[PDB]
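Quick entry between incubations.
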Amino acid sequence: ARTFFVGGNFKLNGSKQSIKEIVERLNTASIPENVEVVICPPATYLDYSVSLVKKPQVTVGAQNAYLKASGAFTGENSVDQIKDVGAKYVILGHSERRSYFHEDDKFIADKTKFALGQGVGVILCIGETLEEKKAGKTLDVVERQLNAVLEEVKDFTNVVVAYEPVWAIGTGLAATPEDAQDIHASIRKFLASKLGDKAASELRILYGGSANGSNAVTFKDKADVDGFLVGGASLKPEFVDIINSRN
Amino acid sequence: ARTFFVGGNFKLNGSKQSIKEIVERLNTASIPENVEVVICPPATYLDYSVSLVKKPQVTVGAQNAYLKASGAFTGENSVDQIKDVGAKYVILGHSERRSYFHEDDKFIADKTKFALGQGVGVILCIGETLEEKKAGKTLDVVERQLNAVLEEVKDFTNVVVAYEPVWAIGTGLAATPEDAQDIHASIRKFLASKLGDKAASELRILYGGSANGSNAVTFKDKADVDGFLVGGASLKPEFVDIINSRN
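Done. Structure below.
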Protein backbone atom coordinates (compact mmCIF):
# COMPACT_ATOMS: atom_id res chain seq x y z
CA ALA A 1 0.00 0.00 0.00
CA ARG A 2 0.90 3.67 0.47
CA THR A 3 4.67 3.82 0.43
CA PHE A 4 6.03 5.89 3.37
CA PHE A 5 7.25 9.26 2.04
CA VAL A 6 9.61 11.70 3.81
CA GLY A 7 10.28 15.02 2.16
CA GLY A 8 13.00 17.41 3.27
CA ASN A 9 12.27 21.12 2.57
CA PHE A 10 15.64 22.88 3.25
CA LYS A 11 13.94 26.27 2.69
CA LEU A 12 16.47 29.13 2.30
CA ASN A 13 19.30 27.16 3.88
CA GLY A 14 22.40 25.31 2.78
CA SER A 15 25.84 25.42 1.14
CA LYS A 16 27.73 23.03 -1.17
CA GLN A 17 29.57 21.74 1.90
CA SER A 18 26.54 21.38 4.18
CA ILE A 19 24.43 19.66 1.47
CA LYS A 20 27.37 17.35 0.78
CA GLU A 21 27.30 16.32 4.45
CA ILE A 22 23.53 15.74 4.38
CA VAL A 23 23.55 13.57 1.26
CA GLU A 24 26.61 11.63 2.34
CA ARG A 25 24.79 10.81 5.58
CA LEU A 26 21.80 9.44 3.67
CA ASN A 27 24.04 7.40 1.38
CA THR A 28 25.63 5.58 4.29
CA ALA A 29 22.95 5.50 6.97
CA SER A 30 20.73 2.46 6.95
CA ILE A 31 17.26 3.41 5.79
CA PRO A 32 14.36 1.11 4.93
CA GLU A 33 13.92 -0.39 1.49
CA ASN A 34 10.27 0.66 1.60
CA VAL A 35 10.73 4.44 1.88
CA GLU A 36 10.68 7.32 -0.65
CA VAL A 37 12.89 10.24 0.48
CA VAL A 38 12.84 13.49 -1.48
CA ILE A 39 15.33 16.23 -0.55
CA CYS A 40 14.45 19.73 -1.70
CA PRO A 41 17.39 22.18 -1.66
CA PRO A 42 17.49 25.75 -2.98
CA ALA A 43 17.55 25.92 -6.80
CA THR A 44 21.21 26.95 -6.74
CA TYR A 45 22.10 23.44 -5.45
CA LEU A 46 19.67 21.21 -7.34
CA ASP A 47 22.17 19.81 -9.88
CA TYR A 48 24.90 19.35 -7.27
CA SER A 49 22.41 17.53 -5.01
CA VAL A 50 21.39 15.06 -7.69
CA SER A 51 25.05 14.45 -8.47
CA LEU A 52 25.78 13.31 -4.92
CA VAL A 53 22.91 10.82 -4.38
CA LYS A 54 24.07 7.18 -4.28
CA LYS A 55 20.88 5.47 -3.04
CA PRO A 56 17.79 4.72 -5.12
CA GLN A 57 15.38 5.61 -2.24
CA VAL A 58 16.60 9.22 -2.42
CA THR A 59 15.55 11.69 -5.14
CA VAL A 60 15.61 15.49 -5.41
CA GLY A 61 12.93 18.16 -5.68
CA ALA A 62 12.70 21.91 -6.20
CA GLN A 63 11.03 24.33 -3.77
CA ASN A 64 8.95 26.24 -6.40
CA ALA A 65 8.65 26.74 -10.16
CA TYR A 66 6.57 28.91 -12.51
CA LEU A 67 3.58 27.94 -14.65
CA LYS A 68 5.46 28.21 -17.97
CA ALA A 69 8.55 26.25 -18.97
CA SER A 70 10.48 29.12 -20.55
CA GLY A 71 10.19 32.75 -21.60
CA ALA A 72 10.60 36.30 -20.28
CA PHE A 73 10.14 35.58 -16.58
CA THR A 74 13.31 36.87 -14.89
CA GLY A 75 14.07 35.17 -11.59
CA GLU A 76 11.78 32.15 -11.84
CA ASN A 77 12.55 28.44 -11.82
CA SER A 78 11.33 26.11 -14.62
CA VAL A 79 10.10 22.56 -14.25
CA ASP A 80 11.94 21.70 -17.49
CA GLN A 81 15.23 22.94 -15.99
CA ILE A 82 14.49 20.97 -12.85
CA LYS A 83 14.05 17.84 -15.00
CA ASP A 84 17.16 18.66 -17.07
CA VAL A 85 19.44 18.42 -14.04
CA GLY A 86 17.80 15.21 -12.86
CA ALA A 87 15.35 16.33 -10.17
CA LYS A 88 11.96 14.62 -9.96
CA TYR A 89 9.58 16.72 -7.84
CA VAL A 90 8.55 20.30 -7.10
CA ILE A 91 6.86 21.71 -3.95
CA LEU A 92 3.86 23.88 -4.89
CA GLY A 93 1.64 25.98 -2.64
CA HIS A 94 3.90 26.12 0.42
CA SER A 95 2.52 28.33 3.21
CA GLU A 96 5.48 30.71 2.78
CA ARG A 97 4.68 31.29 -0.91
CA ARG A 98 0.95 31.57 -0.35
CA SER A 99 1.58 34.29 2.28
CA TYR A 100 4.86 36.25 1.64
CA PHE A 101 4.61 35.89 -2.18
CA HIS A 102 0.82 36.15 -2.55
CA GLU A 103 0.43 32.87 -4.49
CA ASP A 104 -3.34 32.26 -4.62
CA ASP A 105 -5.30 29.08 -5.04
CA LYS A 106 -5.63 29.31 -8.76
CA PHE A 107 -1.97 30.09 -9.30
CA ILE A 108 -1.11 26.98 -7.35
CA ALA A 109 -3.58 24.88 -9.32
CA ASP A 110 -2.24 26.16 -12.64
CA LYS A 111 1.33 25.43 -11.62
CA THR A 112 0.35 21.89 -10.51
CA LYS A 113 -1.41 21.19 -13.75
CA PHE A 114 1.62 22.51 -15.65
CA ALA A 115 4.23 20.58 -13.68
CA LEU A 116 2.41 17.26 -13.91
CA GLY A 117 1.99 17.81 -17.62
CA GLN A 118 5.73 18.13 -17.95
CA GLY A 119 6.41 14.88 -16.10
CA VAL A 120 7.48 16.33 -12.74
CA GLY A 121 5.88 15.10 -9.51
CA VAL A 122 4.22 17.61 -7.20
CA ILE A 123 4.34 17.88 -3.43
CA LEU A 124 1.14 19.89 -2.99
CA CYS A 125 0.94 21.89 0.22
CA ILE A 126 -2.35 22.75 2.02
CA GLY A 127 -3.26 23.94 5.52
CA GLU A 128 -4.91 26.46 7.88
CA THR A 129 -3.89 29.43 10.04
CA LEU A 130 -4.26 29.68 13.81
CA GLU A 131 -7.22 32.05 13.38
CA GLU A 132 -9.00 29.73 10.89
CA LYS A 133 -8.59 26.76 13.25
CA LYS A 134 -9.88 28.73 16.22
CA ALA A 135 -13.07 29.44 14.25
CA GLY A 136 -13.62 25.77 13.37
CA LYS A 137 -12.77 26.28 9.72
CA THR A 138 -9.83 23.81 9.29
CA LEU A 139 -11.70 21.61 6.83
CA ASP A 140 -13.37 24.49 4.98
CA VAL A 141 -9.96 26.02 4.36
CA VAL A 142 -8.28 22.82 3.15
CA GLU A 143 -11.14 21.81 0.89
CA ARG A 144 -11.13 25.25 -0.72
CA GLN A 145 -7.42 24.87 -1.44
CA LEU A 146 -7.93 21.36 -2.82
CA ASN A 147 -11.08 22.20 -4.75
CA ALA A 148 -9.19 24.99 -6.53
CA VAL A 149 -6.61 22.47 -7.70
CA LEU A 150 -9.19 19.80 -8.59
CA GLU A 151 -10.84 22.20 -11.03
CA GLU A 152 -7.60 21.95 -13.08
CA VAL A 153 -6.10 18.56 -12.07
CA LYS A 154 -8.10 15.32 -12.20
CA ASP A 155 -5.39 12.71 -11.69
CA PHE A 156 -3.35 12.67 -8.47
CA THR A 157 -1.17 9.71 -9.34
CA ASN A 158 2.06 11.65 -9.22
CA VAL A 159 0.88 14.05 -6.53
CA VAL A 160 1.73 13.85 -2.83
CA VAL A 161 -0.36 16.12 -0.53
CA ALA A 162 1.26 17.80 2.48
CA TYR A 163 -1.10 18.93 5.23
CA GLU A 164 0.86 21.56 7.15
CA PRO A 165 -1.06 23.51 9.77
CA VAL A 166 0.35 27.01 9.37
CA TRP A 167 0.49 27.55 13.12
CA ALA A 168 2.77 24.53 13.51
CA ILE A 169 5.41 25.61 10.99
CA GLY A 170 8.78 26.30 12.60
CA THR A 171 7.37 26.90 16.12
CA GLY A 172 8.52 23.60 17.61
CA LEU A 173 4.96 22.69 18.54
CA ALA A 174 3.43 20.16 16.19
CA ALA A 175 -0.22 19.15 15.89
CA THR A 176 -1.06 16.17 18.09
CA PRO A 177 -0.85 12.76 16.35
CA GLU A 178 -4.47 12.23 17.21
CA ASP A 179 -5.64 15.48 15.61
CA ALA A 180 -3.47 14.87 12.52
CA GLN A 181 -5.02 11.45 12.11
CA ASP A 182 -8.54 12.91 12.31
CA ILE A 183 -7.91 15.75 9.86
CA HIS A 184 -5.99 13.39 7.56
CA ALA A 185 -8.95 10.98 7.48
CA SER A 186 -11.36 13.86 6.79
CA ILE A 187 -9.14 15.03 3.93
CA ARG A 188 -9.00 11.54 2.50
CA LYS A 189 -12.81 11.10 2.69
CA PHE A 190 -13.42 14.46 1.05
CA LEU A 191 -10.88 13.58 -1.65
CA ALA A 192 -12.46 10.19 -2.23
CA SER A 193 -15.69 12.00 -3.15
CA LYS A 194 -13.76 13.87 -5.90
CA LEU A 195 -11.12 11.41 -7.19
CA GLY A 196 -12.77 8.16 -6.23
CA ASP A 197 -12.31 5.69 -3.39
CA LYS A 198 -9.44 3.98 -5.15
CA ALA A 199 -7.28 7.02 -5.79
CA ALA A 200 -8.09 8.25 -2.28
CA SER A 201 -6.79 5.01 -0.82
CA GLU A 202 -3.51 5.18 -2.77
CA LEU A 203 -2.74 8.89 -2.27
CA ARG A 204 0.02 9.80 0.21
CA ILE A 205 -1.03 12.52 2.67
CA LEU A 206 1.97 13.82 4.58
CA TYR A 207 1.99 15.67 7.94
CA GLY A 208 4.25 18.76 8.13
CA GLY A 209 4.87 21.40 10.87
CA SER A 210 7.57 20.79 13.48
CA ALA A 211 7.97 17.11 12.59
CA ASN A 212 11.25 16.06 14.20
CA GLY A 213 13.39 13.07 15.20
CA SER A 214 11.76 13.02 18.61
CA ASN A 215 8.10 13.13 17.69
CA ALA A 216 8.08 11.31 14.33
CA VAL A 217 7.61 7.93 16.02
CA THR A 218 4.49 9.18 17.83
CA PHE A 219 2.69 9.19 14.48
CA LYS A 220 3.57 5.62 13.58
CA ASP A 221 0.15 4.05 14.28
CA LYS A 222 -1.80 6.72 12.42
CA ALA A 223 -3.08 4.98 9.31
CA ASP A 224 -4.00 8.10 7.34
CA VAL A 225 -0.63 9.75 7.98
CA ASP A 226 1.66 8.48 5.21
CA GLY A 227 4.84 10.40 5.92
CA PHE A 228 6.16 13.89 6.55
CA LEU A 229 7.26 17.16 5.01
CA VAL A 230 10.18 18.08 7.26
CA GLY A 231 11.60 21.60 7.35
CA GLY A 232 14.25 22.43 9.90
CA ALA A 233 14.95 18.88 11.01
CA SER A 234 15.84 18.06 7.39
CA LEU A 235 19.13 19.96 7.82
CA LYS A 236 20.14 17.77 10.77
CA PRO A 237 21.26 14.22 11.55
CA GLU A 238 17.83 13.38 13.07
CA PHE A 239 16.35 13.49 9.52
CA VAL A 240 17.59 9.90 9.41
CA ASP A 241 15.68 9.05 12.57
CA ILE A 242 12.48 10.38 10.97
CA ILE A 243 13.00 8.25 7.86
CA ASN A 244 13.51 5.23 10.14
CA SER A 245 10.59 6.04 12.43
CA ARG A 246 8.40 3.20 11.21
CA ASN A 247 11.19 0.64 11.07
CA ALA B 1 36.03 57.09 -18.44
CA ARG B 2 33.68 54.28 -17.47
CA THR B 3 34.43 50.62 -18.20
CA PHE B 4 32.09 49.16 -20.85
CA PHE B 5 29.71 46.70 -19.19
CA VAL B 6 27.59 44.05 -20.94
CA GLY B 7 25.09 41.98 -18.95
CA GLY B 8 23.26 39.01 -20.42
CA ASN B 9 19.92 38.19 -18.78
CA PHE B 10 18.98 34.69 -19.94
CA LYS B 11 15.53 35.02 -18.24
CA LEU B 12 13.65 31.71 -17.99
CA ASN B 13 15.78 29.98 -20.67
CA GLY B 14 18.58 27.47 -20.67
CA SER B 15 19.74 23.92 -20.27
CA LYS B 16 23.09 22.41 -19.33
CA GLN B 17 23.67 21.97 -23.06
CA SER B 18 22.92 25.52 -24.09
CA ILE B 19 24.90 27.02 -21.14
CA LYS B 20 27.91 25.03 -22.25
CA GLU B 21 27.52 26.38 -25.82
CA ILE B 22 27.21 29.95 -24.59
CA VAL B 23 30.17 29.93 -22.19
CA GLU B 24 32.62 28.03 -24.36
CA ARG B 25 31.93 30.55 -27.15
CA LEU B 26 32.85 33.39 -24.76
CA ASN B 27 35.97 31.60 -23.40
CA THR B 28 37.67 31.54 -26.78
CA ALA B 29 36.27 34.76 -28.26
CA SER B 30 38.40 37.78 -28.95
CA ILE B 31 37.09 40.46 -26.67
CA PRO B 32 38.49 43.74 -25.48
CA GLU B 33 40.96 43.59 -22.61
CA ASN B 34 38.95 45.71 -20.25
CA VAL B 35 35.29 44.94 -20.87
CA GLU B 36 33.18 43.58 -18.02
CA VAL B 37 30.73 40.83 -19.08
CA VAL B 38 28.15 39.38 -16.68
CA ILE B 39 26.13 36.36 -17.75
CA CYS B 40 22.94 35.78 -15.69
CA PRO B 41 21.47 32.27 -16.11
CA PRO B 42 18.64 30.68 -14.16
CA ALA B 43 19.61 29.82 -10.55
CA THR B 44 19.51 26.14 -11.47
CA TYR B 45 22.60 26.74 -13.68
CA LEU B 46 24.63 29.28 -11.67
CA ASP B 47 27.22 26.81 -10.33
CA TYR B 48 27.63 24.97 -13.66
CA SER B 49 28.07 28.31 -15.43
CA VAL B 50 30.80 29.46 -13.02
CA SER B 51 32.57 26.16 -13.44
CA LEU B 52 32.74 26.54 -17.25
CA VAL B 53 34.01 30.15 -17.46
CA LYS B 54 37.63 30.53 -18.49
CA LYS B 55 37.77 34.22 -19.28
CA PRO B 56 38.69 36.95 -16.74
CA GLN B 57 36.29 39.54 -18.24
CA VAL B 58 33.31 37.22 -17.68
CA THR B 59 31.59 36.68 -14.33
CA VAL B 60 28.21 35.15 -13.41
CA GLY B 61 25.13 36.78 -11.86
CA ALA B 62 21.75 35.67 -10.50
CA GLN B 63 18.38 36.93 -11.78
CA ASN B 64 16.85 37.62 -8.35
CA ALA B 65 17.36 36.98 -4.64
CA TYR B 66 15.59 37.64 -1.32
CA LEU B 67 16.35 40.33 1.32
CA LYS B 68 17.66 37.85 3.96
CA ALA B 69 20.44 35.26 3.39
CA SER B 70 18.81 32.31 5.11
CA GLY B 71 15.61 31.21 6.84
CA ALA B 72 12.06 29.98 6.27
CA PHE B 73 11.46 31.37 2.80
CA THR B 74 10.65 28.38 0.62
CA GLY B 75 11.53 28.91 -3.03
CA GLU B 76 13.73 31.98 -2.77
CA ASN B 77 17.34 32.48 -3.81
CA SER B 78 20.01 33.78 -1.43
CA VAL B 79 22.93 36.12 -2.09
CA ASP B 80 25.06 33.95 0.22
CA GLN B 81 24.25 30.93 -1.97
CA ILE B 82 25.14 32.95 -5.09
CA LYS B 83 28.46 33.80 -3.45
CA ASP B 84 29.03 30.15 -2.37
CA VAL B 85 29.04 28.87 -5.98
CA GLY B 86 31.29 31.76 -7.08
CA ALA B 87 28.85 34.07 -8.81
CA LYS B 88 29.37 37.81 -8.25
CA TYR B 89 26.20 39.80 -9.06
CA VAL B 90 22.41 39.77 -8.81
CA ILE B 91 19.79 41.46 -10.97
CA LEU B 92 17.32 43.39 -8.78
CA GLY B 93 14.17 45.27 -9.77
CA HIS B 94 13.76 43.78 -13.26
CA SER B 95 10.49 44.96 -14.84
CA GLU B 96 9.23 41.38 -15.00
CA ARG B 97 9.48 41.12 -11.21
CA ARG B 98 8.09 44.57 -10.57
CA SER B 99 5.06 43.67 -12.69
CA TYR B 100 4.22 39.95 -12.59
CA PHE B 101 5.51 39.44 -9.03
CA HIS B 102 4.51 42.70 -7.47
CA GLU B 103 7.95 43.65 -6.27
CA ASP B 104 7.54 47.21 -4.88
CA ASP B 105 10.15 49.98 -4.80
CA LYS B 106 11.02 49.44 -1.12
CA PHE B 107 11.29 45.65 -1.58
CA ILE B 108 13.92 46.33 -4.24
CA ALA B 109 15.77 48.83 -2.04
CA ASP B 110 15.90 46.37 0.88
CA LYS B 111 17.28 43.67 -1.42
CA THR B 112 19.88 46.08 -2.84
CA LYS B 113 21.16 47.15 0.55
CA PHE B 114 21.30 43.54 1.69
CA ALA B 115 23.18 42.24 -1.39
CA LEU B 116 25.80 44.98 -1.41
CA GLY B 117 26.13 44.31 2.34
CA GLN B 118 27.07 40.69 1.61
CA GLY B 119 29.58 41.71 -1.04
CA VAL B 120 27.61 40.88 -4.14
CA GLY B 121 27.31 43.42 -6.97
CA VAL B 122 23.91 44.65 -8.13
CA ILE B 123 22.45 45.25 -11.58
CA LEU B 124 19.67 47.59 -10.50
CA CYS B 125 16.82 47.92 -13.06
CA ILE B 126 14.53 50.90 -13.41
CA GLY B 127 12.00 51.96 -16.08
CA GLU B 128 8.52 53.37 -16.84
CA THR B 129 5.56 51.76 -18.61
CA LEU B 130 4.02 52.94 -21.88
CA GLU B 131 1.11 54.53 -20.00
CA GLU B 132 3.54 56.34 -17.75
CA LYS B 133 5.57 57.49 -20.82
CA LYS B 134 2.41 58.95 -22.40
CA ALA B 135 1.42 60.75 -19.20
CA GLY B 136 4.75 62.54 -19.25
CA LYS B 137 5.86 60.69 -16.13
CA THR B 138 9.19 59.11 -17.27
CA LEU B 139 11.46 61.04 -14.92
CA ASP B 140 8.91 61.09 -12.08
CA VAL B 141 8.85 57.31 -12.18
CA VAL B 142 12.59 56.62 -12.41
CA GLU B 143 13.35 59.19 -9.72
CA ARG B 144 10.79 57.47 -7.44
CA GLN B 145 12.34 54.05 -8.12
CA LEU B 146 15.85 55.42 -7.43
CA ASN B 147 14.92 57.55 -4.41
CA ALA B 148 13.55 54.40 -2.73
CA VAL B 149 16.94 52.73 -3.19
CA LEU B 150 18.75 55.87 -1.98
CA GLU B 151 16.79 55.66 1.28
CA GLU B 152 18.83 52.56 2.01
CA VAL B 153 21.93 52.74 -0.21
CA LYS B 154 24.12 55.65 -1.20
CA ASP B 155 27.31 53.77 -2.11
CA PHE B 156 26.93 52.77 -5.75
CA THR B 157 30.55 51.58 -6.10
CA ASN B 158 29.43 47.97 -6.74
CA VAL B 159 26.19 48.87 -8.59
CA VAL B 160 25.38 49.32 -12.28
CA VAL B 161 22.03 50.88 -13.24
CA ALA B 162 20.09 49.45 -16.17
CA TYR B 163 17.36 51.65 -17.72
CA GLU B 164 14.64 49.47 -19.23
CA PRO B 165 12.36 51.27 -21.82
CA VAL B 166 9.39 49.10 -20.82
CA TRP B 167 7.32 51.43 -23.03
CA ALA B 168 9.10 49.92 -26.07
CA ILE B 169 8.27 46.24 -25.33
CA GLY B 170 5.91 45.02 -28.05
CA THR B 171 4.30 48.45 -28.18
CA GLY B 172 5.42 49.53 -31.63
CA LEU B 173 7.86 52.07 -30.27
CA ALA B 174 11.61 52.05 -30.78
CA ALA B 175 14.06 53.29 -28.18
CA THR B 176 16.58 55.16 -30.31
CA PRO B 177 20.24 55.75 -29.44
CA GLU B 178 19.55 59.48 -29.18
CA ASP B 179 16.49 58.73 -26.99
CA ALA B 180 18.65 56.58 -24.77
CA GLN B 181 21.44 59.16 -24.57
CA ASP B 182 19.05 61.91 -23.36
CA ILE B 183 17.40 59.79 -20.66
CA HIS B 184 20.75 58.39 -19.44
CA ALA B 185 22.11 61.92 -19.28
CA SER B 186 19.00 62.92 -17.20
CA ILE B 187 19.32 60.03 -14.80
CA ARG B 188 23.02 60.83 -14.34
CA LYS B 189 22.27 64.46 -13.58
CA PHE B 190 19.63 63.48 -11.01
CA LEU B 191 22.05 61.01 -9.34
CA ALA B 192 24.82 63.68 -9.35
CA SER B 193 22.41 65.82 -7.33
CA LYS B 194 22.09 63.06 -4.72
CA LEU B 195 25.51 61.33 -4.73
CA GLY B 196 27.78 64.10 -6.00
CA ASP B 197 29.44 64.53 -9.37
CA LYS B 198 32.32 62.09 -8.82
CA ALA B 199 30.00 59.20 -7.93
CA ALA B 200 27.72 60.13 -10.85
CA SER B 201 30.64 60.18 -13.35
CA GLU B 202 31.78 56.71 -12.19
CA LEU B 203 28.34 55.05 -12.41
CA ARG B 204 27.67 52.75 -15.37
CA ILE B 205 24.14 53.31 -16.78
CA LEU B 206 23.14 50.54 -19.16
CA TYR B 207 20.67 50.45 -22.03
CA GLY B 208 18.12 47.57 -21.78
CA GLY B 209 15.18 46.68 -24.09
CA SER B 210 15.35 45.00 -27.53
CA ALA B 211 19.17 45.14 -27.83
CA ASN B 212 21.26 42.98 -30.78
CA GLY B 213 24.44 42.40 -32.78
CA SER B 214 23.17 44.73 -35.53
CA ASN B 215 22.09 47.81 -33.58
CA ALA B 216 24.63 47.69 -30.73
CA VAL B 217 27.22 49.58 -32.80
CA THR B 218 24.68 52.39 -33.24
CA PHE B 219 25.08 53.34 -29.57
CA LYS B 220 28.91 53.42 -29.73
CA ASP B 221 29.26 57.20 -29.56
CA LYS B 222 26.70 57.97 -26.91
CA ALA B 223 28.62 59.29 -23.91
CA ASP B 224 26.15 58.40 -21.20
CA VAL B 225 25.33 54.93 -22.52
CA ASP B 226 27.89 52.77 -20.76
CA GLY B 227 26.82 49.29 -21.87
CA PHE B 228 23.84 46.98 -22.14
CA LEU B 229 21.60 44.64 -20.22
CA VAL B 230 20.91 42.20 -23.09
CA GLY B 231 17.82 39.93 -23.16
CA GLY B 232 17.17 37.42 -25.98
CA ALA B 233 20.42 38.18 -27.80
CA SER B 234 22.34 36.92 -24.80
CA LEU B 235 21.35 33.35 -25.72
CA LYS B 236 22.80 33.77 -29.25
CA PRO B 237 26.21 33.88 -30.91
CA GLU B 238 25.69 37.61 -31.68
CA PHE B 239 26.11 38.43 -28.00
CA VAL B 240 29.84 38.41 -28.83
CA ASP B 241 29.25 41.09 -31.46
CA ILE B 242 27.49 43.26 -28.89
CA ILE B 243 30.55 42.92 -26.61
CA ASN B 244 32.75 43.95 -29.51
CA SER B 245 30.48 46.76 -30.66
CA ARG B 246 32.75 49.64 -29.55
CA ASN B 247 35.86 48.14 -31.17
